[PDB]
Design a protein around this ligand. Structure first.
Ligand SMILES: N[C@@H](Cc1c[nH]c2ccccc12)C(=O)O
Ligand SMILES: N[C@@H](Cc1c[nH]c2ccccc12)C(=O)O
Ligand SMILES: N[C@@H](Cc1c[nH]c2ccccc12)C(=O)O
Ligand SMILES: N[C@@H](Cc1c[nH]c2ccccc12)C(=O)O
Ligand SMILES: N[C@@H](Cc1c[nH]c2ccccc12)C(=O)O
Ligand SMILES: N[C@@H](Cc1c[nH]c2ccccc12)C(=O)O
Ligand SMILES: N[C@@H](Cc1c[nH]c2ccccc12)C(=O)O
Ligand SMILES: N[C@@H](Cc1c[nH]c2ccccc12)C(=O)O
Ligand SMILES: N[C@@H](Cc1c[nH]c2ccccc12)C(=O)O
Ligand SMILES: N[C@@H](Cc1c[nH]c2ccccc12)C(=O)O
Ligand SMILES: N[C@@H](Cc1c[nH]c2ccccc12)C(=O)O
Ligand SMILES: N[C@@H](Cc1c[nH]c2ccccc12)C(=O)O
Lengths: 63, 66, 66, 63, 66, 66, 63, 66, 66, 66, 66, 63
C-alpha cells in the first residue's frame, strides 16, 4: 500500500492520522522531534494524513 | 488507491470531501494553516475533493500551485 | 479510478456530473470560484463530467487550459 | 475505463453516445458551447462516441 | 478495450462495423461528414471495422492519414 | 485482443480470415478498394489473417508496406 | 496471444503449423504468393510454425 | 511488500514499529549502532516505522540522509 | 508463452524438443534447410529445445548467430 | 518475493533474521567471512533483516557499501 | 517461465538439471558439442541448472561467456 | 521465481541452499569448479542462498 515519508525539520512535528470511513476524526498523532523520520502507510484505519510543523515529505508524487 | 497532496500557501485553506454515491454533499472540511500538508486518498466515502484557498496541489497528473 | 483535476480561472465555473447508465442527466453541479480546485473521480454514479467556465483541466491525457 | 476529452471550439458541438449492443443508435447527445469541456467514458451503455462540430479532442492515442 | 479514432477528411466517409462471430456481415454504417470524428471500440458485437473514404485514423499502432 | 490495420494501396485487396481450431479454412474474405482501411481483431473464430494485394499493414510488431 | 507476421518474397512460400501436444506433425500449410502477408497466432492447436521459402518475418523479438 | 532500508550513522539509533489497526502503539524498538543496517518490511503487524537518531534511509521514494 | 526463433544458416540444422516432466527424452526433431525458419513455443510437452547446426537464434534474451 | 544481497567486506559479518508476527525476536544469525555472499528473501518467517559489520548491501532500492 | 540459453564453446559441455523439492540431485545431463545450443526452462521438476564446460550463457540477468 | 547466477572463479565454490521455514539450516551445498555456472532459483524449499568462494554473481539487482 501507498505510504508517506516524513522527516521533521523542527521539534514537535505532528503526523496526524484521520479515520477511514463515513466519519473523519483524528485517531492518532505521532510526534516527531527534529531529524526523526516516520514512514507511514495508508491502511484500513487511516485514509488521510495531515502533517503540522516544518517537515520534508516524500510521497509517490515527489517531495 | 489514488491520493492528492495539498500544501496550504496561506492560512484558512479548506480541503473538502464530497460523498461517494447517488447523492453529493460535503461530508468533511479540513482546515490547513500556511505550510500544513494534507495527503488524502479517494475512498469508499470520498469520490471528489474540493480545495479552497491558495494551495500547492499534487496528484498523479502533476502539480498546480496557486 | 480515473479522475480529473479542475482549477477555476474565473468565478462561477460549474463542474457537472452526468449519470452512469442507460439514462443521462445532470445529477450534481459543483460551483468553483476563481482559484478553487476540484479533483473528481469517475464513479458508479458518474460516467461523464462537463466543465463550464474558464478552467485549467488535467486528466491522464494531458492539459487543457483557457 | 477509457475516456475522451472534448473541448468545444464553437457553439453547438454535439457529443453523441452510441448504444453498446447488437443495435446502434444514439441514446444521448450532449451539447457543448464554445470553451466547454466534456470528459466522457466508454461504459456499459456507450461503445462509440461521435463528435459533430469543431472541437479539440484528446484520447489515449493523442489529440 | 481497444478503440479506433476516425476523423473524416471529406464528406461521405463511412465507418462500418462487422459482426463478431462465425458469420461476418455489416451490422452498422456510420456516416461522417468532413471534420466529424468517431471514436469506436471493439465490442461483444463488433470485431472488425472498415473505413471507406478519405480519413485520418488513429489506433494503438499509430496513424494513417488519407 | 490483438488487431491488424490494413490499408489497401490498390483496388481489389482481399483480407481473409482463417478459422480458429483443429481445422483451417477461409471463413470470410473482405474486399478493400484503394484507400479503404480494415481494422480487424483476432477472435474466437479467427486465428490467422491473410492479405492479398498491395497493402500497408500495421500490427503490434510494426509496419509492412508495398 | 503471440503471433508472427510473414510476408512472402517469392511465390509458393509455405507457412506450416505444427500440432500442439505430445505428437508433432503439420496440420496445415498456408501457401503465400509473392507480396502476400499472413499474420498467424499461436493457438490451442498450433504451438510451432515453420516457414519454408524466402520471407520477411516479424515476431515479438524483431525481424 | 514495501520495505525500508535504515543505516545508522551513529550509535544508538532506534527503529520503531507502530502497530497496524485501530490502535497505534510502539510494539518493537530495534537498536542499531553505527554502520549497522536494518531492512524492514511493512507487515500484518507494522503499518508505520519511526526512526530516531542520525540515519541514512532508503525507500521506494528515494533517499533521506543525516 | 515464451518462444524461440531459429533460422538455419546451413542445411541439416536440427531443432529438437525435450519432454517436460520427471523424465527427459527427445520427442521430436525438426530439420531445417538453409534459410528455413522455425518459431517454436515452450509448451505443456516441451520444456527445453536443443539446436544442432549453424543457426541464427532469437529469444527474449537476445540473439545468437553461428 | 523481495530479497537482499549482502557481501561481507570483513570477517565476522552477521546477517540476522527477525521473526514475522506480533512478536519480534532474532531467529537466526548467519555469519559471513570476508567476501562471502548471502542472498536472502523476506519470507513467511522473516520480515526484517539486520546486518552487523562492514558489508556491501543491495536491494531493489539500490546499494549501501560500508 | 524463466529460461536459460546455453551455447557450447567447446565439445562435451554438460547442462545438468537439479531436482526441485526437498531433495536435490542431478536428474538429467544434456551434452552439447561445440556450437550447439540448449534453451532450457525452469520447471516443475528443475529448479537449478548447472553448466560445465566452456559456454556462452544468457539469462534475464544478462550474459556470461568463457 | 527469482534466481541467482553463480560463476565459480576458483575450484571448490560452494553454493549453499538454506531451508525455507521457521528453522534455518543448509539442506544442500552444490560445489562448482572454476568456470562452472549454476543458475539457481528460490523455491518452496530454499529461501536464502550463501556463496562461499570467489564467484561472479548476478541477481535481479545487478552483479
Ligand atoms: N494503527 C495505525 C498506524 C498508522 C499508519 N499510518 C498512520 C499515519 C498517521 C497516524 C497513524 C498511522 C493504522 O494502522 O492505520
Ligand atoms: N473519513 C474520510 C477521510 C478522507 C479521506 N480523503 C478525504 C478527503 C477530504 C476529506 C476527508 C477525507 C474517508 O475515509 O473518506
Ligand atoms: N456523489 C458523486 C460525487 C462525484 C464524483 N465525481 C463527480 C463529478 C461531478 C459531480 C459529482 C461527482 C459520485 O460519487 O459520483
Ligand atoms: N449515461 C451515459 C453517459 C455517457 C458516458 N459517456 C458518454 C458519451 C456520450 C454520451 C453520453 C455518455 C453512459 O453511462 O453511457
Ligand atoms: N452497437 C455497436 C456500436 C459500435 C461500436 N464500435 C463500432 C464500430 C463500427 C460500427 C458500430 C460500432 C457495438 O456495441 O458493437
Ligand atoms: N466474424 C469475424 C469477423 C472478423 C474479425 N477479424 C477478421 C479478419 C478477417 C476476416 C473476418 C474477421 C470474427 O469475429 O472472427
Ligand atoms: N486453425 C489453425 C489456424 C492457424 C493459426 N496459426 C497458424 C499457423 C500456421 C498454420 C495454421 C494456423 C489454428 O487455430 O491453430
Ligand atoms: N507438439 C510439440 C510442438 C513443439 C513446440 N515447440 C517445439 C520445440 C521443438 C520440437 C517440437 C515443438 C509441442 O506442443 O510441444
Ligand atoms: N515482528 C515484526 C517485525 C518487523 C517488521 N518490520 C518492522 C519495523 C519495525 C519494528 C519491527 C518490525 C513484524 O512482522 O511486523
Ligand atoms: N524433463 C525436464 C527437461 C528440462 C528442462 N530444463 C532442464 C534443464 C536441465 C536438464 C533438463 C531440463 C523438465 O521438464 O524439467
Ligand atoms: N531441491 C532444491 C534445489 C535448489 C534450488 N535452488 C538452490 C540453491 C542452493 C541449493 C539448492 C537449490 C530446491 O528445489 O530448493
Ligand atoms: N528459514 C529462514 C531463512 C531466511 C530467509 N531470509 C533470511 C534472512 C535472515 C536469516 C534467515 C533467513 C526463512 O525462511 O525465513
Amino acid at each position: 500500500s501507498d505510504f508517506v515519508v516524513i522527516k521533521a525539520l523542527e521539534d514537535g512535528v505532528n503526523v496526524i492520522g484521520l479515520t477511514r470511513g463515513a466519519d473523519t476524526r483524528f485517531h492518532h498523532s505521532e510526534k516527531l522531534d527534529k531529524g526523526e523520520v516516520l514512514i507511514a502507510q495508508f491502511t484500513e484505519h487511516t485514509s488521510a494524513i495531515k502533517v503540522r510543523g516544518k517537515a520534508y515529505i516524500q510521497t509517490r508524487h515527489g517531495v
